[PDB]
Write a protein that binds this ligand. Structure first.
Ligand SMILES: [N+]
Ligand SMILES: [N+]
Ligand SMILES: [N+]
Ligand SMILES: [N+]
Length: 119
């Protein structure tokens, strides 16, 4: 997709065949390149923001929903994200990847078939 290709170009090292195989299969290894790639995608799809964190409503919708997010989805993810103390993570890519880890369970369940967390 458009955003994968662009982000692989915007992120040093991400235009890598072997990483891009993982990316198109929705797997995101814990490595500095992938950290920045994940940040780039979240930024481009407006799922994430360095300052305001994760848009929980936008991610809900990115999980195949068109309604207001379940309250318990919002609650659980806000709590997950706050437990990660994202504001204390100096590297912006690592911060974004850490944030994303809260939503991994959700994305995987979906792949198997605005509510900013930091206002
Ligand atoms: N590139
Ligand atoms: N958004
Ligand atoms: N709800
Ligand atoms: N946080």
């Amino acid at each position: 997709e458009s955003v994968i290709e662009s982000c692989s170009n915007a992120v040093q090292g991400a235009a890598n065949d072997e990483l891009k195989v993982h990316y198109r299969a929705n797997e995101f290894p814990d490595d500095p390149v992938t950290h920045c790639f994940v940040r780039c995608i979240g930024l481009e799809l407006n799922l994430y923001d360095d300052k305001y964190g994760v848009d929980l409503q936008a991610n809900w919708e990115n999980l195949g929903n068109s309604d207001d997010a379940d309250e318990e989805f919002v609650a659980k993810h806000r709590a997950c994200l706050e437990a990660k103390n994202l504001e204390t993570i100096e590297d912006l890519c690592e911060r974004a990847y850490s944030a994303f880890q809260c939503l991994r369970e959700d994305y995987e369940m979906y792949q198997n078939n605005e509510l900013w967390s930091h206002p």
